[PDB]
């Protein structure tokens, strides 16, 4: 049977600031999405965060866009505003709901959304990624590496089905434009493009030999825009294996966003601090020092007649431990920096902060004048 | 609503020696709060300990300096004295109520009490600090960061609000004066007393563009004085963000106090052994190696019409890990000097030890006089 | 009142191995301490393990060298080796119940044995160590340092009351003789002796000024000898701080033991995997690598009337997770030594093995004679 | 007497590839400016290269903006290029000798250059920065801390004359304006400029008690622009004491540049690899792995009389061994990043490089057609 | 034959500032002290540096306090001042030259002078240390680990000539008063005293057998006072053995000093540039980050005959490598709290600064009366 798999993500109260979800938030989203289960609207769920940002998973045959399955998460989010996050004066209450009113679809009403639409396999094990505190663009490197480059993904060396490779949907979220580039061949060119990870942003990712569709990143063209993604991978035959999916974040590289959206630190793969299969819930970290440093978490799960079996957090190793510990100590390092770029974003990503107000003053001298007259108007300063 | 928030904390008793309180003693002060809360003397509460201090933190409507609050606060110290730290045997039992009477007000009677009265805001987090083994002014650079310190608070450069700075309230516990500096243009003179830790300690923060209070710490001019400080800081919406508060955290920098009140170590920030937000009650970090480190724990709540959500361990992250990491080689390494300046401290926080005692003995020579004389003192003493 | 607190340690079993014991050993232990509880034959008791060796802690008033404290102890290990080690078959079951009668003293048939009796103080906090793995030479260092390095034990430079320093009772237990040393001024001597840790072994140590009893170490004369010590020591007030104890074992020594009683490595000091004080038992350390490295591991208490309260697991704290660090890494280090002194124990401590019996061969040469034959010698060998 | 101390900078030709200077190329500046020395055009001279830039330092009475001494340096580079880059066939020969008349003055012709015209002092130490693979904006950050951060300075806060504090000088090399701000007061503004380093840069710093000029920084306007800027700085008495300055580079911030102008990595502050103050040249390091990672090296002086007397490498401590291996480490963490912001510069950075050009390619589709055409863009690429 | 051996140590001219000596200064004090070697007046010399302060040490047969060697050193020192600092303008040249007359005797003029006349053995080692960046007080723990801690001398615990310890020359600078203690019984109380490295400051050190000097360290009763202190000890044969000297260096304490003479951080055991026993020179270490940190070097000798045969750089060892990295490492922990205590001296070492001066504002409101007024003089100053 054809399974949709859909993420949808919000950030609607911090617990306190933006540190974390409070987890009657987690407990009340997973009471109202076992009754949409009962009532038959979806499958199977499972509700989780990571720092400030709640996650719906949803399992359901309505396919991708649809507007009960985009309804009742919003519908959901609006009710924990409502009940818990207005309740408890949680910070930044209905932060992400942006819009008011809600025409049909989620999409640019603030929510993130990422979904699959595909014929469930023999086996299919999915991944489901959250990361808090940074942008969608942070995932464009994992996506590269997991899909093509073969120092991370040995199935495109040694496995005759991943030998053809893969079609990046490229979204110019600035210009409203979408790129088809194809690895192998279009390599350097996707590289091109994605390296600017604040504009060019990989949104999908289709296996070449045969179509299917292998990743959906969270990304939408400016306005709303895009905080806090969350990626949905399939693994496994012909596909990235799971290791390989999580290799791709064995190495803590530096994501934008961090405090205030304004400064670029290392992504830390966490674990959750919870993972309760039972109640269909799981607690993620904290963000802590500086508000992060940026955080993303796995969980995985098997899928079954549309059921989600999982998750298990697959971020929980001692080998994770080592990469914890080196973004730990470059949190530290790129710190002591302050606010100087490249610690700090560049001015664009500040433009949409209020730098520019600001230099409502100095008054600036032309250079040309200026320069014959620097004695005269030190001498002024000084007196 | 104008909500009053109330930390009063005390040592009154040790289990084993300086290492730890009993659980009881947070059980019993719960217990009793609760009452106080059930006959509307108070909104909400929390009881916690790092090392062997237990703080009250309690919400309220009677304002700053009030009896009632404060003498809630005498009463529920007293009855664990009798009924726990007596009860038991514990170690300096008793210890921080110095005084006997109990005129109106709880300041310069041993225990340490920060308050703020604030309109509440529509979110409105705060941090509560409690550091064992050290010293008021131990704060004194958090602080300084927190509100004057580009490199710590990205808020100070690019958010608007914070941009003209803040009030600095600082108290001469030697002289009793206080003195009003403002940053950032009194930085320099700020810094110039503030970093005399054991005389000029920030007391007070307010925001300078609308007045607003935005963080008290724990001071009384001396006689009592003042050991192991709490703190209170107001987050968000023009004021520092949670997360960068938590960043004037993550070097652990040396604070005065540890063993004996006379050694110099780090403030490691510690993780609270449990939290257990449904009986309001947590339990922090026990003190080991030589009486310490020193530790600071860091609890953040929202309040909502006065009740406290919360606490969440804002301690509990693994960024903060390699913090702890280091704090634990600095103590390793600075321990290695034994009783010498600087590790030891200066003369006159030794003065209330009893180093001064000994040299009832020895017989000092006057200079002059012994050095045309060296030959025979020698000879003396070598038979 | 005069108290007596009685460490009684024995290894009974062990479960694998030499690695830990069973559980129920513990259990069946601290239930039939509650009977003598019950019967008034003693005040209050604690029961744990450190690797293989458990500890009977219990208070009492029959004073040291009781024949039914003792006689508790015997009739309490002997039931665990046959309601336990026996029928779990576990290693060297009844192993350090040499001896088979049972005159009156428990001390020289195999269990290690340290009390005190001391009138109780207004508080009084104990710490109660146990090693495994090791010989109680080990604590030879921990002991000097603690009542006699300046480096370790601040008080004794700026507390008045430790400045007069502390006599030690050393054991000569080769040639069943005792030294009286006191410190300051016998240090160097007392370091020539105990620096043989295998031979000169601290016993006790005594307050100075008054008298008082600070200390007592597990140590018997050879014959028995002494396995996996045990230790008291009283903190606080005169006496070391609490702290200064802790100290003396932040630094991972090199102690006599490990893998058969002939290797030596770092004193790693361990956390507890579980303390429950309202069943008087807690679980220590596995012994692993080689059969350690070796532990010990420290619970503090406060005794009021005599009862327990307690324990607390004083290395419990991450500034001590250097140290384990550490240890971890030269456990490491000196094992890629093998065979060789020093890790390997000289021939005296090898003697009590049986490398000697081996050497039935080589056929030995004398030297003089071998001189001017070497080349037939080796001509035979050759062919 | 008014001496002028002049650095003008130039890279013209690379040995190999862009790694470092060949030596020739130093004997022979140095020898050309010892003719004007005996010509009595200039009063002393230094030679050195960091990377592929070479320095001539030279005192001189012509004051600031001179023909003769622009004229000099700019004669004797054309000289080292026909003489030796274009003979040896060196890489980028004559690379920054971009404009090819020579109206009067230097600036904006390719090379960099600082000057600072004052009363020489009773002692008069200045230092000399170089820094290779970089911009002009990756000073901004010493600058600022040197001058204005407490925690870099102490002068700041403990001694009289800095107090007041130092006006800044400020360039906007995007639309030639200058902005004028004074710390402490202007801390933030001038943070929330210099921090956007492409296009706010530190050219000028004045001591603000008395107008003294303190630093100056190599920067023009853009058309030429700026790579590898050179720094003067004057230090003592009033002004930053050497080592605050040279605390100022203790932490290897990332900057701008490295490989191909358009990656970040670390600023490593090296050594020189041979210092001659005899025959007036310095060799200093290579450029290696990746063209770096980005250097700065430092030579200190004593001026009497406009004489030179140095210069020491201040880089020379094994203080500066342990930032060393910090951005060793850095640029290896950093690196494995790839083509990625923010490890590779923004898209601003890069349009003056070709990514652009490419882009002739692929066809973009807009998002609302390709949106409901996904399926069959698919199907046409698989097939 | 009795010898003197002198050591008279002055800071003439830094260059530049304070981090280095020029080397002219060197060559020039050496061809001085070659002449007065020439004419009898001393046996041997050598002229050596560490940081910014030039030592000359000299044997002789006129002991202690003479004022022909004292007067050599004076008019060597006023020599390279006029002939060298002042013609190449070096920084703060002249700068121990305090008082202007010339009495008889160097001490309490500036420069700092450690002698000792013994009867020359028949082998007779002895080091000399200088250090900068500190003060005298920085050699008063390697003095007493070296002669009365028994964890550095092993020859305390197993030599059976220093078995009885050895007698300390104490000083108090403040009070102009000796006081004598003798170690192993006074160990206590040396420490109550010398651990107040600021005041009580080890001057010498006797053997307590015989009598014999053993060591000399360089401190005069303030009013000059004593800045970079230099040390003469004798070793081998029932005293230290010379590792054991250089043991009680191993670790890089804290020691006052480093920046303007306000700060503390580690003593690093340096490594000298180059030592030239030919012509009798060596120079020591520059002094960089943040003028420092403060160093340590030390030459070791063999005197026959009154001749000195060396010196021997005894911290060029890999095993020296280790503690330079360690004090790299904490020098850069340290520095990160900026002005604060204890990285910053206590307010009495600063007093001889100018942070009292500053404090001709604020005004200080005295407490009693602000409390009742906070809110209006916030008011104000908000307004
Ligand atoms: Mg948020
Ligand atoms: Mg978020
Ligand atoms: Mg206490
Ligand atoms: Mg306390
Ligand atoms: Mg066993
Ligand atoms: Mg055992
Ligand atoms: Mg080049
Ligand atoms: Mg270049
Ligand atoms: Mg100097
Ligand atoms: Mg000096």
New interface residues.
């Given amino acids: 049977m054809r399974v949709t798999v859909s993420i949808i993500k919000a950030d609607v109260g911090?617990?306190?600031?933006?540190?974390?979800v409070?987890p009657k938030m987690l407990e009340y989203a997973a009471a109202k999405l076992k009754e949409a289960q009962k009532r038959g609207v979806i499958i199977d769920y499972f509700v989780y965060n990571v720092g400030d940002d709640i996650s719906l998973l949803m399992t359901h045959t309505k396919g991708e866009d649809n507007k009960d399955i985009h309804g009742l998460a919003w519908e959901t989010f609006k009710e924990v505003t409502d009940q818990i996050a207005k309740?408890?004066?949680?910070?930044?209450?209905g932060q992400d709901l942006l819009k008011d009113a809600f025409s049909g679809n989620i999409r640019g009403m603030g929510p993130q959304v990422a979904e699959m639409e595909f014929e469930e396999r023999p086996s299919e094990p999915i991944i489901a990624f959250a990361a808090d505190k940074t942008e969608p663009?942070a995932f464009?490197?994992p996506l590269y590496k997991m899909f093509a480059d073969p120092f991370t993904t040995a199935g495109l060396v040694i496995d005759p089905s991943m030998h053809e490779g893969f079609?990046f949907?490229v979204?110019?979220v600035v210009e409203?434009?979408?790129?088809?580039?194809?690895t192998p061949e279009?390599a350097y060119?996707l590289?091109?493009?994605?390296?600017?990870?604040?504009?060019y942003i990989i949104r999908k990712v289709?296996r070449?030999?045969?179509?299917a569709p292998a990743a959906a990143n969270s990304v939408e063209?400016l306005s709303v825009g895009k905080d806090d993604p969350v990626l949905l991978v399939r693994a496994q035959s012909g596909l990235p294996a799971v290791g390989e999916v999580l290799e791709a974040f064995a190495?803590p590289?530096?994501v934008?966003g961090w405090?205030?959206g304004?400064?670029?630190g290392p992504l830390?793969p966490?674990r959750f601090i919870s993972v309760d299969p039972e109640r269909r819930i799981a607690i993620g970290?904290?963000?802590?020092?500086?508000?992060?440093?940026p955080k993303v978490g796995a969980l995985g799960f098997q899928l079954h007649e549309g059921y989600l079996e999982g998750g298990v957090d697959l971020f929980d190793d001692p080998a994770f431990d080592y990469v914890?510990?080196?973004?730990?100590?470059?949190?530290?390092?790129?710190?002591?920096?302050?606010?100087?770029?490249?610690?700090?974003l560049?001015?664009?990503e500040?433009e949409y902060?209020?730098?520019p107000?600001?230099?409502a003053?100095?008054k600036?001298?032309?250079?040309?004048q200026?320069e014959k007259d620097?004695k005269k108007?030190?001498?002024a300063?000084?007196k």
Same sequence: chains 1, 2, 3, 4, 5.
């Fill in positions: 911090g617990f306190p600031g933006h540190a974390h409070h309740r408890f004066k949680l910070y930044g209450a663009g464009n490197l079609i949907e979204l110019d409203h434009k979408v790129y088809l580039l194809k279009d060119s590289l091109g493009l994605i390296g600017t990870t604040g504009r289709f070449r030999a045969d179509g063209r190495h590289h530096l934008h405090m205030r304004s400064h670029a830390m966490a970290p904290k963000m802590t020092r500086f508000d992060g440093p914890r510990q080196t973004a730990a100590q470059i949190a530290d390092y790129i710190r002591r920096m302050g606010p100087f770029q490249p610690h700090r560049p001015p664009e500040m902060t209020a730098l107000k600001i230099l003053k100095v600036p001298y032309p250079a040309d200026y620097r108007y030190i001498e300063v000084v």
